[PDB]
């Protein structure tokens, strides 16, 4: 129904998604493990 010129801009359908602690070296073991390690050290 209307005349289009050549595309002045090209686009497509795209996906938009939403985009270390100081003591993070303790992260491999849980906090309870460290606490029980201290307790076991005292007991030993």
């Amino acid at each position: 129904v209307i005349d289009f010129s050549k595309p002045f801009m090209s686009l497509g359908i795209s996906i938009m998604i939403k985009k270390p602690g100081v003591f993070s070296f303790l992260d491999p073991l849980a906090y309870e493990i460290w606490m029980c390690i201290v307790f076991a050290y005292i007991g030993v």
């Binding site: 606490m35 307790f39 005292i42 007991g43």
Partner: protein, 33 residues
């Protein structure tokens, strides 16, 4: 706070046991001398 009450109880119990063991040792050293 009651979990940490138990933990503090553990720590104090170990320290008091160490104190009792020193008293036993001291009694026997005084007996020796």
């Amino acid at each position: 706070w009651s979990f940490y009450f138990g933990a503090l109880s553990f720590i104090i119990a170990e320290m008091v046991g160490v104190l009792a063991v020193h008293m036993f040792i001291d009694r026997h050293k005084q007996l020796r001398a």
